Design a protein around this motif. Structure first.
Motif, short mmCIF file in Angstrom:
data_model
loop_
_atom_site.label_atom_id
_atom_site.label_comp_id
_atom_site.label_asym_id
_atom_site.label_seq_id
_atom_site.Cartn_x
_atom_site.Cartn_y
_atom_site.Cartn_z
N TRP A 89 0.82 -1.20 0.00
CA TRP A 89 0.00 0.00 0.00
C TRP A 89 0.85 1.25 0.00
O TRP A 89 0.71 2.09 -0.88
CB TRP A 89 -0.89 0.04 1.24
N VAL A 123 0.84 0.98 -4.21
CA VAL A 123 -0.42 1.68 -4.40
C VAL A 123 -0.46 3.16 -4.10
O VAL A 123 -0.63 3.97 -5.01
CB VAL A 123 -1.55 1.01 -3.59
N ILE A 126 3.26 6.65 -0.89
CA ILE A 126 3.54 7.59 0.17
C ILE A 126 5.02 7.47 0.50
O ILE A 126 5.61 8.36 1.12
CB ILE A 126 2.73 7.25 1.41
N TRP A 165 -13.16 5.75 2.95
CA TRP A 165 -11.74 5.85 3.24
C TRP A 165 -11.46 5.34 4.65
O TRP A 165 -10.73 4.37 4.85
CB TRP A 165 -11.28 7.31 3.13
N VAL A 195 -9.22 2.24 4.38
CA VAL A 195 -7.83 2.64 4.30
C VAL A 195 -7.21 3.19 5.56
O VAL A 195 -6.34 2.57 6.16
CB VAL A 195 -7.68 3.72 3.22
N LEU A 209 -5.26 0.38 7.86
CA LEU A 209 -3.81 0.49 7.91
C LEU A 209 -3.35 0.75 9.33
O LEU A 209 -2.58 1.68 9.59
CB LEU A 209 -3.33 1.60 6.97
N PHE A 247 -1.56 9.11 11.14
CA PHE A 247 -1.56 8.59 9.79
C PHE A 247 -2.26 9.55 8.86
O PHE A 247 -1.73 9.95 7.82
CB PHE A 247 -2.28 7.25 9.75
N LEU A 255 -0.84 11.24 5.53
CA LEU A 255 -1.44 11.21 4.21
C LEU A 255 -1.60 12.66 3.77
O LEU A 255 -1.18 13.04 2.68
CB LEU A 255 -2.81 10.55 4.26
N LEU A 266 -7.10 7.85 -5.61
CA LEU A 266 -6.68 6.69 -4.83
C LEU A 266 -7.64 5.53 -4.60
O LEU A 266 -7.35 4.40 -5.00
CB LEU A 266 -6.19 7.16 -3.46
N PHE A 294 -7.26 1.82 -5.21
CA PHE A 294 -7.08 1.02 -4.00
C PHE A 294 -7.94 -0.24 -4.03
O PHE A 294 -7.49 -1.31 -3.65
CB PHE A 294 -7.43 1.86 -2.78
N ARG A 301 -6.59 -4.18 -3.79
CA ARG A 301 -6.87 -4.83 -2.52
C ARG A 301 -6.62 -6.34 -2.65
O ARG A 301 -5.95 -6.93 -1.81
CB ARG A 301 -8.32 -4.54 -2.10
#
Lengths: 118, 124
Positions: A71, A75, A78, B18, B22, B26, B37, B41, B53, B57, B61
């Motif tokens: 990720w 993906v 970052i 999200w 995500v 995460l 986090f 981002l 995204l 995403f 997955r």
């Protein structure tokens, strides 16, 4: 009866027991039999070497994974590939020097967080 | 004064899809508290990225889960190296477990089941 022994001998090997048979606890007596059961002679007397030359690769893979890098990089992006490859190097370096994966991964998470907050 | 932007995106991160798929998930990094986090981002990804995204995403997955599975199930060894398990077997196994997790199954729990069917295979 010999064959069963000749190999039973290699699994009982120390290099094997410490580098493969026991290590793969990630799932011992049985496993041994499974190996005995699956792999043939020629295979046995050929695996260890090939094993040592892939131990790094297999760990980077584990790291990539455990570090949610599918990720963070592939993906989301970052994290730069450069940063990522580097990090995988260092930690693999460690683990390959005796560092306990478990403990090493923790250090990798650390350095990762660092990067993220940069 | 580019305040707007900060908001526009803060809006997406605060999105539901999200947060649930995500930002929250995460948490695998000791998730240094979601809160952070989110800022990371916010700090890294730009606007165009953000409104691009998720779809991207959702389409990965699966791929990303197989990877995790392959790893967690010591397949680098069992297959690529030792060859104790056929690729056919391996792929199949990764499929079904992934099928599960993709249908809501908790990875954690799902991996356990994969461990099970694996042992099965090994003992065949």
């Amino acid at each position: 009866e010999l064959m069963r022994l000749m190999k039973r001998r290699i699994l009982e090997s120390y290099r094997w027991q410490e580098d493969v048979v026991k290590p793969l606890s990630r799932e011992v007596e049985e496993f041994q039999d499974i190996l005995m059961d699956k792999l043939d002679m020629s295979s046995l007397e050929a695996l260890h070497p090939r094993f040592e030359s892939a131990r790094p690769r297999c760990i980077r893979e584990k790291l990539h994974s455990d570090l949610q890098l599918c990720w963070l990089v592939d993906v989301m992006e970052i994290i730069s590939v450069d940063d990522a490859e580097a990090l995988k190097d260092e930690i693999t370096e460690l683990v390959l020097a005796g560092r306990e994966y478990s403990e090493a991964l923790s250090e990798g998470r650390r350095r990762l967080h660092e990067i993220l907050r940069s």
